[PDB]
Design an enzyme around this catalytic site. Structure first.
Site, PDB file in Angstrom:
ATOM      1  N   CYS A 149      -2.245  23.893  10.627  1.00  0.00           N
ATOM      2  CA  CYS A 149      -2.279  22.640   9.885  1.00  0.00           C
ATOM      3  C   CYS A 149      -2.299  22.888   8.382  1.00  0.00           C
ATOM      4  N   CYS A 154       0.222  20.001   9.183  1.00  0.00           N
ATOM      5  CA  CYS A 154      -0.056  18.650   8.704  1.00  0.00           C
ATOM      6  C   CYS A 154      -0.085  18.576   7.179  1.00  0.00           C
ATOM      7  N   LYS A 157       3.409  19.311   5.380  1.00  0.00           N
ATOM      8  CA  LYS A 157       4.299  18.287   5.921  1.00  0.00           C
ATOM      9  C   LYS A 157       4.031  16.935   5.268  1.00  0.00           C
ATOM     10  N   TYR A 291       8.241  15.283  17.050  1.00  0.00           N
ATOM     11  CA  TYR A 291       7.778  14.688  15.803  1.00  0.00           C
ATOM     12  C   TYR A 291       7.978  15.644  14.636  1.00  0.00           C
ATOM     13  N   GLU A 295      10.060  14.477  11.432  1.00  0.00           N
ATOM     14  CA  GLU A 295       9.350  14.460  10.156  1.00  0.00           C
ATOM     15  C   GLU A 295      10.075  15.308   9.115  1.00  0.00           C
ATOM     16  N   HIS A 566      -6.101 -10.473   4.192  1.00  0.00           N
ATOM     17  CA  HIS A 566      -4.828 -10.888   3.632  1.00  0.00           C
ATOM     18  C   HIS A 566      -4.759 -10.523   2.154  1.00  0.00           C
ATOM     19  N   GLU A 571      -3.285  -6.912   9.336  1.00  0.00           N
ATOM     20  CA  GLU A 571      -3.811  -8.187   9.818  1.00  0.00           C
ATOM     21  C   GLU A 571      -2.936  -8.802  10.899  1.00  0.00           C
TER      22      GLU A 571
HETATM   23  C1  LIG Z   1       4.945  21.150  11.535  1.00  0.00           C
HETATM   24  C2  LIG Z   1       3.632  20.837  12.238  1.00  0.00           C
HETATM   25  C3  LIG Z   1       3.093  19.629  11.770  1.00  0.00           C
HETATM   26  C4  LIG Z   1       1.876  19.185  12.309  1.00  0.00           C
HETATM   27  N1  LIG Z   1       1.306  17.903  11.826  1.00  0.00           N
HETATM   28  C5  LIG Z   1       0.058  17.463  12.378  1.00  0.00           C
HETATM   29  C6  LIG Z   1      -0.516  16.169  11.877  1.00  0.00           C
HETATM   30  O1  LIG Z   1       0.074  15.561  11.036  1.00  0.00           O
HETATM   31  N2  LIG Z   1      -1.781  15.736  12.434  1.00  0.00           N
HETATM   32  C7  LIG Z   1      -2.487  16.542  13.462  1.00  0.00           C
HETATM   33  O2  LIG Z   1      -3.519  16.213  13.916  1.00  0.00           O
HETATM   34  N3  LIG Z   1      -1.897  17.803  13.927  1.00  0.00           N
HETATM   35  C8  LIG Z   1      -0.636  18.225  13.384  1.00  0.00           C
HETATM   36  N4  LIG Z   1      -0.098  19.464  13.859  1.00  0.00           N
HETATM   37  C9  LIG Z   1      -0.839  20.204  14.905  1.00  0.00           C
HETATM   38  C10 LIG Z   1      -1.970  21.028  14.282  1.00  0.00           C
HETATM   39  O3  LIG Z   1      -1.435  21.887  13.353  1.00  0.00           O
HETATM   40  C11 LIG Z   1      -2.557  21.798  15.474  1.00  0.00           C
HETATM   41  O4  LIG Z   1      -2.996  20.905  16.440  1.00  0.00           O
HETATM   42  C12 LIG Z   1      -3.731  22.634  14.968  1.00  0.00           C
HETATM   43  O5  LIG Z   1      -3.328  23.481  13.946  1.00  0.00           O
HETATM   44  C13 LIG Z   1      -4.197  23.495  16.152  1.00  0.00           C
HETATM   45  O6  LIG Z   1      -5.387  24.083  15.712  1.00  0.00           O
HETATM   46  P1  LIG Z   1      -5.843  25.476  16.492  1.00  0.00           P
HETATM   47  O7  LIG Z   1      -7.199  25.886  15.950  1.00  0.00           O
HETATM   48  O8  LIG Z   1      -5.784  25.313  17.989  1.00  0.00           O
HETATM   49  O9  LIG Z   1      -4.708  26.582  16.154  1.00  0.00           O
HETATM   50  P2  LIG Z   1      -4.161  27.134  14.720  1.00  0.00           P
HETATM   51  O10 LIG Z   1      -4.391  26.131  13.609  1.00  0.00           O
HETATM   52  O11 LIG Z   1      -2.696  27.423  14.970  1.00  0.00           O
HETATM   53  O12 LIG Z   1      -5.004  28.506  14.385  1.00  0.00           O
HETATM   54  C14 LIG Z   1      -4.863  29.610  15.218  1.00  0.00           C
HETATM   55  C15 LIG Z   1      -5.114  30.847  14.300  1.00  0.00           C
HETATM   56  O13 LIG Z   1      -5.383  31.932  15.020  1.00  0.00           O
HETATM   57  C16 LIG Z   1      -4.328  33.037  14.541  1.00  0.00           C
HETATM   58  N5  LIG Z   1      -4.225  34.022  15.604  1.00  0.00           N
HETATM   59  C17 LIG Z   1      -3.371  33.994  16.637  1.00  0.00           C
HETATM   60  N6  LIG Z   1      -3.609  35.067  17.404  1.00  0.00           N
HETATM   61  C18 LIG Z   1      -4.617  35.750  16.844  1.00  0.00           C
HETATM   62  C19 LIG Z   1      -5.246  36.916  17.232  1.00  0.00           C
HETATM   63  N7  LIG Z   1      -4.993  37.771  18.396  1.00  0.00           N
HETATM   64  N8  LIG Z   1      -6.242  37.418  16.507  1.00  0.00           N
HETATM   65  C20 LIG Z   1      -6.637  36.774  15.377  1.00  0.00           C
HETATM   66  N9  LIG Z   1      -6.019  35.624  14.998  1.00  0.00           N
HETATM   67  C21 LIG Z   1      -5.010  35.114  15.741  1.00  0.00           C
HETATM   68  C22 LIG Z   1      -3.242  32.341  14.314  1.00  0.00           C
HETATM   69  O14 LIG Z   1      -2.258  33.089  13.492  1.00  0.00           O
HETATM   70  C23 LIG Z   1      -3.824  31.141  13.531  1.00  0.00           C
HETATM   71  O15 LIG Z   1      -4.128  31.454  12.237  1.00  0.00           O
HETATM   72  C24 LIG Z   1       1.197  19.937  13.295  1.00  0.00           C
HETATM   73  C25 LIG Z   1       1.733  21.140  13.739  1.00  0.00           C
HETATM   74  C26 LIG Z   1       2.952  21.581  13.204  1.00  0.00           C
HETATM   75  C27 LIG Z   1       3.610  22.914  13.670  1.00  0.00           C
HETATM   76  C1  LIG Z   2      -6.368 -15.561  -7.940  1.00  0.00           C
HETATM   77  C2  LIG Z   2      -6.797 -15.844  -6.507  1.00  0.00           C
HETATM   78  C3  LIG Z   2      -6.547 -14.735  -5.685  1.00  0.00           C
HETATM   79  C4  LIG Z   2      -6.880 -14.821  -4.325  1.00  0.00           C
HETATM   80  N1  LIG Z   2      -6.628 -13.648  -3.453  1.00  0.00           N
HETATM   81  C5  LIG Z   2      -6.964 -13.750  -2.062  1.00  0.00           C
HETATM   82  C6  LIG Z   2      -6.697 -12.562  -1.184  1.00  0.00           C
HETATM   83  O1  LIG Z   2      -6.209 -11.585  -1.666  1.00  0.00           O
HETATM   84  N2  LIG Z   2      -7.032 -12.676   0.221  1.00  0.00           N
HETATM   85  C7  LIG Z   2      -7.617 -13.923   0.774  1.00  0.00           C
HETATM   86  O2  LIG Z   2      -7.883 -14.039   1.912  1.00  0.00           O
HETATM   87  N3  LIG Z   2      -7.862 -15.067  -0.114  1.00  0.00           N
HETATM   88  C8  LIG Z   2      -7.542 -14.948  -1.509  1.00  0.00           C
HETATM   89  N4  LIG Z   2      -7.790 -16.088  -2.339  1.00  0.00           N
HETATM   90  C9  LIG Z   2      -8.400 -17.290  -1.728  1.00  0.00           C
HETATM   91  C10 LIG Z   2      -7.335 -18.137  -1.025  1.00  0.00           C
HETATM   92  O3  LIG Z   2      -6.368 -18.481  -1.938  1.00  0.00           O
HETATM   93  C11 LIG Z   2      -8.110 -19.372  -0.547  1.00  0.00           C
HETATM   94  O4  LIG Z   2      -9.143 -18.983   0.292  1.00  0.00           O
HETATM   95  C12 LIG Z   2      -7.141 -20.278   0.209  1.00  0.00           C
HETATM   96  O5  LIG Z   2      -6.058 -20.618  -0.589  1.00  0.00           O
HETATM   97  C13 LIG Z   2      -7.913 -21.563   0.544  1.00  0.00           C
HETATM   98  O6  LIG Z   2      -7.066 -22.269   1.405  1.00  0.00           O
HETATM   99  P1  LIG Z   2      -7.325 -23.906   1.500  1.00  0.00           P
HETATM  100  O7  LIG Z   2      -6.389 -24.460   2.558  1.00  0.00           O
HETATM  101  O8  LIG Z   2      -8.782 -24.222   1.718  1.00  0.00           O
HETATM  102  O9  LIG Z   2      -6.988 -24.509   0.034  1.00  0.00           O
HETATM  103  P2  LIG Z   2      -5.631 -24.409  -0.866  1.00  0.00           P
HETATM  104  O10 LIG Z   2      -4.799 -23.200  -0.493  1.00  0.00           O
HETATM  105  O11 LIG Z   2      -6.136 -24.370  -2.293  1.00  0.00           O
HETATM  106  O12 LIG Z   2      -4.759 -25.772  -0.565  1.00  0.00           O
HETATM  107  C14 LIG Z   2      -5.285 -27.007  -0.928  1.00  0.00           C
HETATM  108  C15 LIG Z   2      -4.043 -27.905  -1.225  1.00  0.00           C
HETATM  109  O13 LIG Z   2      -4.369 -29.194  -1.214  1.00  0.00           O
HETATM  110  C16 LIG Z   2      -3.882 -29.771  -2.626  1.00  0.00           C
HETATM  111  N5  LIG Z   2      -4.644 -30.981  -2.882  1.00  0.00           N
HETATM  112  C17 LIG Z   2      -5.820 -31.064  -3.519  1.00  0.00           C
HETATM  113  N6  LIG Z   2      -6.202 -32.348  -3.527  1.00  0.00           N
HETATM  114  C18 LIG Z   2      -5.260 -33.054  -2.885  1.00  0.00           C
HETATM  115  C19 LIG Z   2      -5.169 -34.404  -2.613  1.00  0.00           C
HETATM  116  N7  LIG Z   2      -6.096 -35.490  -2.952  1.00  0.00           N
HETATM  117  N8  LIG Z   2      -4.125 -34.890  -1.949  1.00  0.00           N
HETATM  118  C20 LIG Z   2      -3.142 -34.045  -1.539  1.00  0.00           C
HETATM  119  N9  LIG Z   2      -3.234 -32.715  -1.805  1.00  0.00           N
HETATM  120  C21 LIG Z   2      -4.301 -32.224  -2.476  1.00  0.00           C
HETATM  121  C22 LIG Z   2      -4.108 -28.781  -3.453  1.00  0.00           C
HETATM  122  O14 LIG Z   2      -3.377 -28.942  -4.734  1.00  0.00           O
HETATM  123  C23 LIG Z   2      -3.551 -27.589  -2.640  1.00  0.00           C
HETATM  124  O15 LIG Z   2      -2.187 -27.540  -2.646  1.00  0.00           O
HETATM  125  C24 LIG Z   2      -7.445 -15.999  -3.785  1.00  0.00           C
HETATM  126  C25 LIG Z   2      -7.674 -17.097  -4.607  1.00  0.00           C
HETATM  127  C26 LIG Z   2      -7.346 -17.009  -5.968  1.00  0.00           C
HETATM  128  C27 LIG Z   2      -7.589 -18.201  -6.941  1.00  0.00           C
END
Ligand SMILES: Cc1cc2nc3c(=O)[nH]c(=O)nc-3n(C[C@H](O)[C@H](O)[C@H](O)COP(=O)(O)OP(=O)(O)OC[C@H]3O[C@@H](n4cnc5c(N)ncnc54)[C@H](O)[C@@H]3O)c2cc1C
Ligand SMILES: Cc1cc2nc3c(=O)[nH]c(=O)nc-3n(C[C@H](O)[C@H](O)[C@H](O)COP(=O)(O)OP(=O)(O)OC[C@H]3O[C@@H](n4cnc5c(N)ncnc54)[C@H](O)[C@@H]3O)c2cc1C
Lengths: 587, 587
Positions: A149, A154, A157, A291, A295, A566, A571
C-alpha cells in the site's frame, strides 16, 4: 468458560499484571514497572463482569487470590512485596526478560498487517521482531519499509488519481470565473513522481522510527519459517542465521502475476514499477480489467496519455456488474480506449528503453479476440494487471505443516490461526478475506491484543466497504445486486436507485445522469439494506459512514428517517424512492 | 385505536380508495380512475397488520365491509358498480371535484418546505394551490420561485464556495506536476455570478414546470390568512381577492435582520443581495458571526477579496465552540481578518454605487469594542449577517388565533399543527426546529402524506446533521461537547479525538494537524455516540452516512468494529483511540 480464558491469557501474554483500579499495592507495582520501563499488559478485574470469578481462578496459577499478581511468559512472578524485592535487588530486569525463545513474536513481512501487529504487540511487552525484504521486480525496482500500500499501492495510486482529478478542476475553474490559458497548461510526469516518492520516503522513514520508538527489532532480511519456532533469515550480505520465536505471524502479502507469454517479463511492467517510473509511459496498453487496471488506466489518460485497456471478458469481476459497466462507460466517454474480448499472445521489442534520456521504448503487442480475429498494435509501455499471487514456499510450508489452499493462500481459523498452533497469518495471504489495507491492519492489531493483552475480540470480515478510485469513483458496501438475488431470490429483493448530479457539476457543465446510487434490500427482512452502491465524486467519503449503519443492520426505513445534509451528493441516499421493479426512470 | 386512525384518514383525504392487492373489482376501479386521470391515495388493506379490523370499521362510514370502497372529502362515494355507474354516466368528474372550498390545500410560501408539501399533496388528488411572493430587498433585489435555499441560500452559497475552493486546486495542481503560470490567473466575479444565476434560473423554471405537471395551481401572489379557511391574495397588479382552502400550510420562511443603526438599510447589503450582485464587493466588512457570515467571508477572501469579519462575542453560537474556534483559526490563517468583541454604530456613505460602470461605492463604518475603544475604517461593501426573522403579521395571526412565540415563530404540535386545527406550519417558521432545507422538505412531504394518504409517520427532528461550508468545512451530528457535559456531567462523558491530514494535502504541502475529528460519548450508556464532529475537506460527504448510524443508536464499539476505506479522511472515525481525559496529544 472464564477459566479457559484465563488459562489462554496467562499462557500467551508476555508480561501481564492483574490489577484493580483502586488498589494502592497495584499502583506500587505499576510505578515500579513504569520506572523500570518494563512494558506490560494490565487487566483491571473490577472492570470485568466475571472479575470475581477470575480472581478465584488466579489461585490455580499463583496459589493466591489477591491483586496485584504479575506474570511473565506463563509463570506467576509474585505479588507486590515480591516484585519489589526483585526491584530493590536489581533482579527484576533479568526476571522479566527470561525467555525460552529469542522473541515473543516474529512477524515475517513489514507491510500493512505486519507493521500493525508488531507495533501493537510491543505495546504489551512482547519482545518483537519484524522482518521485511522487498524482492526486486524483473527490471530491478525495489523500495523501502511499509509494504504494498505505502510503496506501490493505495498511497501512490491515490496521489496520481488526485493529479488526474486536478485536470478537471482546471477545466472547471474557468466556468467558475477563473481566467487561465489552458492552451499553455501541460503535465510533467517526473515532477509528479518526485513528489509522490518524496512522500513515500517520509513514510518509509516514519515506520522505521516508529519501530525503534516501540523497541521493535526491525531486520531488513528475508525470512523463512523452517520449523514452528525457527525463522531462518538472510541479510543483504547473504549471511544466513536462525532466530527463534514463541508466536509467528506470517504477513508476507502478494506480488503481481505475469501472463505466460513471450516478452511479458522482459518488456512489460506492472504496478510495482509504475509508481516510480522515471519516464512517462507514453502510449500505454493496460492488460487486465481489475480495479488496479482501471485505476491506472484512468489517471494515465487524465495526465495526457494515449491509453488502451485490453479486457479478456468483463470489468471488475466480483463487483456489482451494473456498476462496473457504468464505471467503464464513463472511462470510455472520457478518453480511455478498450480492446474487448481480447487477450495477448506475445510482446515484441521494437526499441529499448532509453534510461539516459529518460524515454520509454517501443513494443509490438500481438493478440487475438474470441472470433479468432487478430490484434496487433504498437505501444510505448505495456502494463500487466492480471492479478496478484502469494509467494509462499509450498514445499517449505508443507514440511512445517502450514496448510495452503488451491491458490497458495493460508487456511486460517476465525482467529487467524494456521494448522500450526503458534503460527498465524494476516493480510492478503489469509485465504478468503478481503484483500484491503484496513482489513490487514485491523486483523493484525486485534490478533496482537488477543495474544498479549487477554483480548477476545475477533476481526469481523463481513460487509467490508471498498472504493475503486477510477476517474469517476465507485464506492460499495455489502452485496452486489446479483449476489443478493442469488442468495434470496428476485421476489425477495427490492432495489431503490437514482441518478444524481453534483451541484459542483452544474456551473461546470458536466453530465446529467451519470452519477448513480442504489440500495439493494431484502423485503422479507424489514427491507434490510444488503448492499449500498454509489458512482460519483468522493465516493469513499460518501460510503464510509454508511458502513457503520450497515454493520448495525440498517433498514431502508433507517435511511428514510435520517435527514439529509444539503447540498451534498450523499444526501440522495436519504430520499430514494424509485424501485427497479416499478420500471420508473431513475433520472 | 384503528378506528380513530380510520376516522382521521377518511375525514382528511381528498380522494382515497380502500383496496386489496388481489381484487379484480379494485383493479376495475383503479383502471377507471387512471383512465379518467383522477389522482387518489390508495390503501391496500392486505398490507396492514390491522387490515381486517380496518375493513370492519369501514362499515361505520359506508355500511359495507368489502373492497373496493371509494371516498371523496369524507364521504363514501360507492363500491365498484357505483363508481362505474358514475363513470359510464359522465357523472364521476363532478363527483370527485365537489368541494366546500376552492382548494383542499393552500400553501402560503413557495420555498423548500412549501413546494415539497404542495407537490406531495397533489400526488394524492388534493386540489392544491401554492402561493409565492418575494418581497424586494431595500435596494430592490428580487428573484424567482424556489425560496431562500434555491435563490439566496444553500445553492448559490455552495457554488461560490466551490469557486473559492478551486483557488487551492490551482495551487495544488503545480505540486502534482501541472504547469500553469499563476502570475497570470485572476478571478472574474461577474462571470461567476452569471453562471450561478443561470443555474438558479433553471431551478426557478424547473419548479414552475413541476407544479404545472402535478396540476398544482401556482399563484405569484402575496397571501394573508384572514380566517381559518380564507386566504386573501394580492397579485402583481395589486388586485385583491379571496380563496378558500380546507387545509392551510404556512411555509413563509424568514428574511435577514438589519441592526438598528444609522445607514444600515441605506448603505449595507445582506445575503439576499450578495448572490446576484453585479459588481465584486471589493474590500468588504461582514458584520456577524453566524455560519452565513463565515461562509460568505470565506469565499470572498478566496476570490481575492480584502475581507474583515466583525464579531460581537463568539463565532457560531450554538455550535460546538472548540470546533468553531478551529474554523475561525483556519480562516484567520488563510486571509480573513477579524474585528473581535466589536459592534457597529453607524454606516456613512462616502461614494455612491456606480451602477453604470458596475463598481461598488465606499462607506465609513464607525463602531466600538467593549473596552470602550473606537472602531473606524473604510469599506467598499458592508454585509450584515446578524440573524434572520419571520415576517408573520402578529396582529393578523392573533385574530385568526395562530399562536406565536417570543420570536414571532409558530408554536406547533409534533405533527406541525398550529393552535388552529386546519392550519399547519413547516420550515424555518416552525418554532424550535432546525432551520435547514432537508428538514423543511421532510416535514412538508411527511405532513402531506398524513393529511391526504392516511400516513402516520412524523418527522424526527433529533440528531439532524449539519455542515458549515467555510474554507475548511465543519460537519456535525448530535450534541456539542459542552452540551453533552451539561446534560450528563463531565464524569459520564468520554471524548475520542484525532488530528488527520488528507492524503491529497501531502504532495500539496498543506498543513499537518489542522483537520480534526472527535466523538463525544456517554460512558454509562455503552459509550453511546452523542455527537460527531469533523473539520476537513468534503465534511458534508463525510458526516452524512454517520447520521444514519447515530439515529440507530451507534456506540463507540459500532465504529470500532467497522473497517475503514483507505485512503479516505472518513476512515479515521473507525480507529479513534486517544481520549481527552488521557491528556495524550491528538496529533
Ligand atoms: C496497485 C494496488 C493498489 C491498491 N489500492 C488499495 C486501496 O486503495 N485501498 C485498500 O484498502 N487496499 C489497496 N490495495 C491492497 C493493499 O495494498 C493490500 O491489501 C495490503 O498491502 C496488504 O497488506 P499485507 O500486510 O497483507 O501485505 P504487504 O503490504 O504486501 O506487505 C508484505 C511485506 O512482506 C514482504 N515480504 C514478502 N516475503 C517476505 C519474506 N520471506 N521475508 C520478509 N519479508 C517478506 C513483502 O515484500 C512486503 O513488504 C492495493 C494494492 C495494489 C497492488
Ligand atoms: C445564506 C444562507 C445559506 C444557507 N445555506 C444552507 C445549507 O447550506 N444547507 C441547509 O440545509 N440550509 C441552508 N440555509 C437555510 C435554508 O435556506 C432554509 O432552511 C430554507 O430555505 C427554509 O425553507 P422554508 O420553506 O421554511 O422557507 P423559504 O425557503 O425561505 O421559502 C419561503 C417562501 O415563501 C415567500 N413568502 C413569504 N411570505 C409570503 C407570503 N405572505 N405570501 C406568499 N409567499 C410568501 C418567501 O418570499 C419565500 O419565497 C441557508 C440560508 C441562508 C440565508
Amino acid at each position: 468458560g472464564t477459566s479457559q480464558w484465563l488459562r489462554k491469557t496467562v499462557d500467551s501474554a508476555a508480561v501481564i499484571l492483574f490489577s484493580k483500579t483502586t488498589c494502592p499495592y497495584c499502583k506500587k507495582v505499576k510505578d515500579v514497572l513504569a520506572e523500570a520501563k518494563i512494558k506490560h499488559a494490565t487487566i483491571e478485574l473490577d472492570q470485568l463482569s466475571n472479575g470475581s470469578a477470575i480472581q478465584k481462578c488466579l489461585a490455580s496459577f499463583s496459589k493466591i487470590e489477591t491483586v496485584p499478581q504479575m506474570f511473565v511468559r506463563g509463570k506467576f512472578i509474585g505479588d507486590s512485596q515480591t516484585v519489589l524485592k526483585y526491584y530493590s535487588n536489581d533482579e527484576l530486569a533479568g526476571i522479566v526478560n527470561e525467555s525460552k525463545y529469542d522473541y515473543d513474536l516474529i512477524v515475517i513481512g513489514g507491510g500493512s498487517g505486519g507493521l500493525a501487529a508488531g507495533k501493537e504487540a510491543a505495546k504489551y511487552g512482547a519482545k518483537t521482531a519484524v522482518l521485511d525484504y522487498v524482492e526486486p521486480t524483473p527490471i530491478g525496482t525495489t523500495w523501502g519499509l511499509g509494504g504494498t500500500c505505502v510503496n506501490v499501492g493505495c498511497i501512490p495510486k491515490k496521489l496520481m488519481h488526485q493529479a488526474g482529478l486536478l485536470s478537471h478542476a482546471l477545466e472547471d475553474a474557468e466556468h467558475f470565473g477563473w481566467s487561465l490559458d489552458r492552451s499553455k497548461i501541460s503535465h510533467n510526469w517526473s515532477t509528479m513522481v518526485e513528489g509522490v516518492q518524496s512522500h513515500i520516503g517520509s513514510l518509509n522513514w516514519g515506520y522505521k522510527v516508529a519501530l525503534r520508538d516501540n523497541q521493535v527489532t526491525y531486520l531488513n532480511a528475508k525470512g523463512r519459517l523452517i520449523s514452528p519456532h525457527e525463522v531462518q533469515i538472510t541479510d543483504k550480505n547473504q549471511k544466513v542465521s536462525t532466530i527463534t520465536g514463541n508466536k509467528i505471524i506470517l504477513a508476507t502479502g502478494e506480488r503481481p502475476k505475469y501472463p505466460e507469454i513471450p516478452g511479458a517479463v522482459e518488456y512489460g511492467i506492472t504496478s510495482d514499477d509504475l509508481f516510480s517510473l522515471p519516464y512517462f509511459p507514453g502510449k500505454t496498453l493496460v492488460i487486465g480489467a481489475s480495479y488496479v487496471a482501471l485505476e491506472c488506466a484512468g489517471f494515465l489518460a487524465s495526465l495526457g496519455g494515449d491509453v488502451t485497456v485490453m479486457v479478456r471478458s468483463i470489468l471488475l469481476r466480483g463487483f456489482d456488474q451494473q456498476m462496473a459497466e457504468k464505471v467503464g462507460d464513463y472511462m470510455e466517454n472520457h478518453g480511455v480506449k478498450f480492446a474487448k474480448l481480447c487477450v495477448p499472445d506475445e510482446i515484441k521489442q521494437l526499441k529499448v528503453v532509453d534510461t539516459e534520456n529518460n524515454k520509454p521504448g517501443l513494443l509490438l503487442v500481438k493478440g487475438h479476440y474470441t472470433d479468432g480475429k487478430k490484434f496487433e498494435e504498437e505501444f510505448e509501455t505495456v502494463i500487466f494487471a492480471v492479478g496478484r499471487e502469494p509467494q509462499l514456499s509450498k514445499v517449505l510450508c508443507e514440511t512445517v505443516g502450514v496448510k495452503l489452499d488451491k491458490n497458495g493462500r493460508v487456511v486460517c481459523t476465525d482467529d487467524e490461526q494456521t494448522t500450526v498452533s503458534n503460527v498465524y497469518a494476516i493480510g492478503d495471504i489469509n485465504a478468503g478475506k478481503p484483500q484491503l489495507t484496513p482489513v490487514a491492519i485491523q486483523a493484525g492489531r486485534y490478533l496482537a491484543r488477543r495474544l498479549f493483552a487477554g483480548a477476545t475480540e475477533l476481526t469481523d470480515y463481513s460487509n467490508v466497504a471498498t472504493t475503486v478510485f477510477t476517474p469517476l469513483e465507485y464506492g460499495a458496501c455489502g452485496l452486489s445486486e446479483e449476489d443478493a438475488i442469488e442468495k434470496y431470490g428476485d421476489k425477495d429483493i427490492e432495489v431503490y436507485h437514482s441518478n444524481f448530479k453534483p451541484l459542483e457539476w452544474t456551473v461546470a457543465h458536466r453530465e446529467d445522469n451519470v452519477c448513480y446510487m442504489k440500495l439493494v434490500c431484502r423485503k422479507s427482512d424489514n427491507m434490510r439494506v444488503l448492499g449500498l452502491h454509489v458512482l460519483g465524486p468522493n465516493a469513499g467519503e460518501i460510503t464510509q459512514g454508511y458502513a457503520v449503519a450497515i454493520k448495525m443492520g440498517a433498514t431502508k426505513a433507517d435511511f428514510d428517517r435520517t435527514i439529509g445534509i444539503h447540498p451534498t451528493c450523499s444526501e440522495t441516499f436519504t430520499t430514494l424512492h424509485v424501485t427497479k421493479k416499478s420500471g420508473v426512470s431513475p433520472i
